[PDB]
């Protein structure tokens, strides 16, 4: 199967500047007809994929001429002379030269902005959930950039593992920041064994890790 390999997996871009995505096929996508069967698809957030470039360098109707496709034997490239805020989404490359048809992993294009440190908040379990026998502790990393971030839970200064799950918002369209939630789940009984619950955050926008914590059963 003609493997398609894209890079980079993620690609932040500053509006107004250039931008490029590379694709590579295991086999030669050139044919006797002369037509090279490489396709570029763009999937805008929350939408269905849309054909962007067909047969290597052909622009689909309606595609801004800022976009352009090129290639050489097995190395292909998508270029955006200058980037608009509307070009964000996952770009997939694909081949229809051979069955079965195949795609590349895709390249997620996002807006590159100035670093912003996360504002951190921690949330103890509500008393309602506690009577239900469970305790969820929530640490919130709000309006930050870039996305990469390490969030670790310390319970009585003991680092936790596998005990937590995180979920991350998609880039805000107003300020290009993200938000991450790290939920910690415990038994009501395992929760009443310890006092200090801490959320320690590492990020590019913080000189050093920022810790937010609370002592159980007291505010």
């Amino acid at each position: 199967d003609i493997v398609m390999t894209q890079t980079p997996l993620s690609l932040p871009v500053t509006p107004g500047e250039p931008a490029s995505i590379s694709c590579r096929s295991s086999k030669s996508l050139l044919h006797s007809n002369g037509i090279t069967y490489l396709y570029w698809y763009l999937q805008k957030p929350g939408q269905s994929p849309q054909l962007l470039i067909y047969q290597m360098s052909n622009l689909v109707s309606g595609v801004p001429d800022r976009f352009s496709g090129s290639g050489s034997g097995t190395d292909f490239t998508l270029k955006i002379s200058r980037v608009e805020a509307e070009d964000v989404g996952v770009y997939y490359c694909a081949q229809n030269l051979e069955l079965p048809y195949t795609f590349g992993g895709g390249t997620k294009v996002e807006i590159k902005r100035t670093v912003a440190a996360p504002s951190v908040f921690i949330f103890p379990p509500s008393d309602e959930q506690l009577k239900s026998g469970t305790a969820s502790v929530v640490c919130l990393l709000n309006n930050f950039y870039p996305r990469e971030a390490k969030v670790q839970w310390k319970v009585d200064n003991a680092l936790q593992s596998g005990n937590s799950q995180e979920s991350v918002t998609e880039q805000d369209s107003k300020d290009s920041t993200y938000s991450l939630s790290s939920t910690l789940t415990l038994s009501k009984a395992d929760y009443e064994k310890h006092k200090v619950y801490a959320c320690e955050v590492t990020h590019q926008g913080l000189s050093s890790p920022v810790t937010k914590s609370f002592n159980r059963g007291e505010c």
Binding site: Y39, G104, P124, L140, N142, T183
Partner: protein, 220 residues
């Protein structure tokens, strides 16, 4: 005026089968290849197969090992995609796409059809307050939210003050866990100076279970 309208979302028990409709219009239905493409949550695109309604000719991807059957009804310009022996990994969005001869591969796409595969049973969520607090410290500006936990299936919608509060709100993508159930939080930052003036309420709506709950998040 080409358009591709697929059937609605689907929730199936593992080992079962699903049949997605693909209604096409605006062109000669019989003379364009209909392709099917799938996309697992947060993952790439996967070519499933293709049918030529004009002669019922079909091609499939080997990986699906016969679990896929593509059909087409000329009289209604509708193409069908049937998956067999469903497993959790089959949880994804399924697209139908139309070709246009002379290189225009996959030029038209449907709105997509979500198919979630699990053994979980429909259940409304529990709604817990993420109460605002701080007291001492610094950085004067409060955070509050709602823990919407243990529900099936997706999706759930959350608003604030019945839509009046949209600025600052962040509703995180649900995460599936060891139970068949989902879970998520909806948070919002407001002037900590306002906790004594503005009543904040999260409006959780879970259509699948006909569950609606408005929880007031007061300080403490």
């Amino acid at each position: 005026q080409v358009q591709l309208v697929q059937s609605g979302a689907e929730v199936k028990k593992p080992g079962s089968s699903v049949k997605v409709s693909c209604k096409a219009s605006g062109y000669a239905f019989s003379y364009s290849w209909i392709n099917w493409v799938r996309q697992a949550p947060g993952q790439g695109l996967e070519w499933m197969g293709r049918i030529f309604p004009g002669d019922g000719d079909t091609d499939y991807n080997g990986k699906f090992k016969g679990r896929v059957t593509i059909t087409a009804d000329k009289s209604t310009s509708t193409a069908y995609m049937e998956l067999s022996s469903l497993r959790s990994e089959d949880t994804a969005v399924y697209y139908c796409a139309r070709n246009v001869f002379d290189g225009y591969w996959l030029v038209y796409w449907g709105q997509g059809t979500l198919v979630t595969v699990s053994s979980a049973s429909t259940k409304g969520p529990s709604v817990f307050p993420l109460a605002p607090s701080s007291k001492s410290t610094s950085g004067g500006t409060a955070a509050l939210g709602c823990l919407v936990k243990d529900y099936f299936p997706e999706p759930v919608t959350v608003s604030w003050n019945s839509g009046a509060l949209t600025s600052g709100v962040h509703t995180f993508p649900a995460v599936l866990q060891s139970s068949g159930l989902y879970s998520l939080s909806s948070v919002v930052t407001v002037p900590s100076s306002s906790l004594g003036t503005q009543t904040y309420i999260c409006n959780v709506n879970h259509k699948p279970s006909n569950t609606k709950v408005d929880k007031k998040v007061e300080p403490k």
